[PDB]
Design an enzyme around this catalytic site. Structure first.
Site, PDB file in Angstrom:
ATOM      1  N   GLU A 198      10.426  14.248   6.434  1.00  0.00           N
ATOM      2  CA  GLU A 198      10.840  13.346   6.134  1.00  0.00           C
ATOM      3  C   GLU A 198      12.632  13.496   5.396  1.00  0.00           C
ATOM      4  O   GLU A 198      13.849  12.241   6.468  1.00  0.00           O
ATOM      5  CB  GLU A 198      10.094  12.794   4.414  1.00  0.00           C
ATOM      6  CG  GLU A 198      10.969  11.790   3.867  1.00  0.00           C
ATOM      7  CD  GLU A 198       9.732  11.201   2.991  1.00  0.00           C
ATOM      8  OE1 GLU A 198       8.596  12.493   2.341  1.00  0.00           O
ATOM      9  OE2 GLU A 198      10.151  10.499   2.591  1.00  0.00           O
ATOM     10  N   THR A 206       6.209  11.129  -3.782  1.00  0.00           N
ATOM     11  CA  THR A 206       7.699  11.293  -4.835  1.00  0.00           C
ATOM     12  C   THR A 206       7.314  10.749  -5.823  1.00  0.00           C
ATOM     13  O   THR A 206       7.857  10.629  -7.111  1.00  0.00           O
ATOM     14  CB  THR A 206       8.369  11.146  -4.443  1.00  0.00           C
ATOM     15  OG1 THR A 206       8.454  11.673  -2.975  1.00  0.00           O
ATOM     16  CG2 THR A 206       9.865  11.165  -4.954  1.00  0.00           C
ATOM     17  N   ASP A 253       3.593  11.987   6.424  1.00  0.00           N
ATOM     18  CA  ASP A 253       2.365  11.808   5.269  1.00  0.00           C
ATOM     19  C   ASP A 253       0.668  12.279   5.825  1.00  0.00           C
ATOM     20  O   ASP A 253       0.683  13.124   4.425  1.00  0.00           O
ATOM     21  CB  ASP A 253       2.434  10.230   5.358  1.00  0.00           C
ATOM     22  CG  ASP A 253       3.910   9.689   4.296  1.00  0.00           C
ATOM     23  OD1 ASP A 253       3.850  10.721   3.954  1.00  0.00           O
ATOM     24  OD2 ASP A 253       3.957   8.941   4.425  1.00  0.00           O
TER      25      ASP A 253
HETATM   26  O1  LIG Z   1       7.138   9.376   0.232  1.00  0.00           O
HETATM   27  P1  LIG Z   1       5.760   9.468   0.043  1.00  0.00           P
HETATM   28  O2  LIG Z   1       5.387   9.918  -1.523  1.00  0.00           O
HETATM   29  O3  LIG Z   1       6.404  11.303   0.467  1.00  0.00           O
HETATM   30  O4  LIG Z   1       4.010   9.631   0.794  1.00  0.00           O
HETATM   31  C1  LIG Z   1       3.878   8.120   0.921  1.00  0.00           C
HETATM   32  C2  LIG Z   1       2.756   8.316  -0.702  1.00  0.00           C
HETATM   33  O5  LIG Z   1       1.998   9.424   0.156  1.00  0.00           O
HETATM   34  C3  LIG Z   1       2.181   6.865  -0.719  1.00  0.00           C
HETATM   35  O6  LIG Z   1       0.772   7.061  -1.181  1.00  0.00           O
HETATM   36  C4  LIG Z   1       1.734   5.978   0.883  1.00  0.00           C
HETATM   37  O7  LIG Z   1       1.757   4.954   0.425  1.00  0.00           O
HETATM   38  C5  LIG Z   1       3.402   5.805   1.077  1.00  0.00           C
HETATM   39  O8  LIG Z   1       3.232   4.952   2.418  1.00  0.00           O
HETATM   40  C6  LIG Z   1       3.556   7.459   1.573  1.00  0.00           C
HETATM   41  O9  LIG Z   1       4.715   7.280   2.530  1.00  0.00           O
HETATM   42 GD   LIG Z   2       7.568  12.864   0.693  1.00  0.00          GD
END
Ligand SMILES: O=P([O-])([O-])O[C@@H]1[C@H](O)[C@H](O)[C@@H](O)[C@H](O)[C@H]1O
Ligand SMILES: [Gd]
Ligand SMILES: O=P([O-])([O-])O[C@@H]1[C@H](O)[C@H](O)[C@@H](O)[C@H](O)[C@H]1O
Ligand SMILES: [Gd]
Lengths: 272, 272
Positions: B66, B91, B216
């Site tokens: 990411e 996060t 994710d």
């Molecule tokens: O940004 P990240 O916290 O690594 O990952 C996110 C989390 O899993 C969140 O629950 C989801 O709703 C988002 O679509 C993701 O992008």
């Molecule tokens: Gd993340």
């Protein structure tokens, strides 16, 4: 009331043992007020255990219990010492083995909560609080978060047990207003008592819901406030335990901001 | 690949240790593309540590992560062995101390996922899975639920990171449709990988979301399928790891019923 409380923590641990052995076995799932309002044999027998164990030691005390009030008894809160009991908060989770189910016991004298116990058995987490002596999880002291800025806050709420379209519509639009402020996010773990305890730990900054019952929140309410948080009606006024609405927050700043944004949903009171 | 896997499990437990000490301490929080799109020093630190150790031991292998991508690396998947990594999924939970955060590692060869490790460090739960060898949590075999009737199912989903009014009104619209079928309930734990892992355990019956990224979900997808579940695009078509859209259900009957109900949001692919 310390004796009562010590006794209460013992009862909660035991009923939590029953609830958590039942969760892995086959269940009989029956219907209460609708197809999505459920009850199992375990809600009923655990509530029976708890009420008769307390009555034994404290025969003059009054009770309000979920399944009792279902069996025809009334939810009227008087000045007498009253145990307010949810044998399983999060029954839909229980049926699904979704790992958040709580046993909740609140204790009111003069219509004010004196102590509360919330036992989350799948996690092995015992929340306790007594008026003026602080809130603890497994013997460690809890404190709400310090966030005062709504745009940086994390909220918990539930969608509710109603499927009346207009009601559902108001719930979702109350969410949309908050989401679009924006706040950092919204979570739901499936139980009002555990949602509230997550506020008390400082995991979340605030919780709100309309549609809960007095037994769902009587135990966890004193845990939030003894952790430094606040309870409030959605009008911004004083919390009314029988009103079916609650805002439980880290402080009054966030609490008042939520009350400002959300609209009131018409419900029948527990005392009507 | 079992050596890579045993390696992966050791790395993910190590990094889970870093993450879960960090969560106790103060962070300085940074925004990326929006006020609700967050990143900290630990996300970056942990991803860097993870990529260094893998390519120390596996120099020919590729990486998609990411924060790498945020620093201008590109998310194109080849047939090469590739590690797809999310240092902290959740996060926003991490920043708040909401007790659900995961390290996620998927490993693709010929652009199919071979194994997956997801470490939920606050609970001390290690979910692992290898193609054709089953899904496990701390050495315990997982199996999805048997639910085939949508009106008795418990769903998980996330409100998402968009605050664009049009997107949000569609997210909630899709919720309303499902809620009103009706289903038993909807939950959100705050991380896609853990949400999917709760489907694998049988705790929830299905997960869906639009707006996720490949990192994710690369780890948890094979944990669900090896527990006996299915993955599918929201369109009804086959799962595309780069499409930003996913249904992870216990069975094809639920997956296809959810797809029928919900409308698709136009999204930019990860490999574009
Ligand atoms: O940004 P990240 O916290 O690594 O990952 C996110 C989390 O899993 C969140 O629950 C989801 O709703 C988002 O679509 C993701 O992008
Ligand atoms: Gd993340
Ligand atoms: O019925 P119960 O499971 O004991 O309690 C319910 C749960 O706390 C649910 O999460 C909440 O949304 C409802 O308002 C409560 O009534
Ligand atoms: Gd209950």
């Amino acid at each position: 009331w310390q004796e009562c409380m010590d006794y209460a923590v013992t009862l909660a641990r035991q009923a939590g043992e029953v609830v958590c052995e039942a969760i892995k076995n086959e269940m009989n799932v029956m219907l209460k007020s609708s197809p999505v309002d459920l009850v199992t044999a375990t809600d009923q027998k655990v509530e029976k255990m708890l009420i008769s164990s307390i009555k034994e030691k404290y025969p003059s005390h009054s009770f309000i219990g979920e399944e009792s009030v279902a069996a025809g008894e009334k939810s009227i809160l008087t000045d007498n010492p009253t145990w307010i009991i949810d044998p399983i908060d999060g029954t839909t989770n229980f049926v699904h083995r979704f790992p958040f189910v709580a046993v909740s016991i609140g204790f009111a004298v003069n219509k004010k909560i004196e102590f509360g116990v919330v036992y989350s058995c799948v996690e092995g987490k015992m929340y306790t609080a007594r008026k003026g002596k602080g809130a603890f999880c497994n013997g460690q002291k809890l404190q709400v978060s310090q966030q005062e800025d709504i745009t940086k806050s994390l909220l918990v709420t539930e969608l509710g047990s109603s499927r009346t379209p207009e009601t559902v519509r108001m719930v979702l639009s109350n969410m949309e207003k908050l989401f679009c402020i924006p706040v950092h996010g919204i979570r739901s773990v499936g139980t009002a008592a555990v949602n509230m305890c997550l506020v008390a730990t400082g995991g979340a900054d605030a919780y709100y819901e309309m549609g809960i019952h007095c037994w769902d929140v009587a135990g966890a309410g004193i845990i939030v406030t003894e952790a430094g948080g606040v309870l409030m009606d959605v009008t911004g006024g004083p919390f009314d335990l029988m009103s079916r609405r609650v805002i439980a927050a880290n402080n009054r700043i966030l609490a008042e901001r939520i009350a400002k944004e959300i609209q009131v949903i018409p419900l029948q009171r527990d005392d009507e």
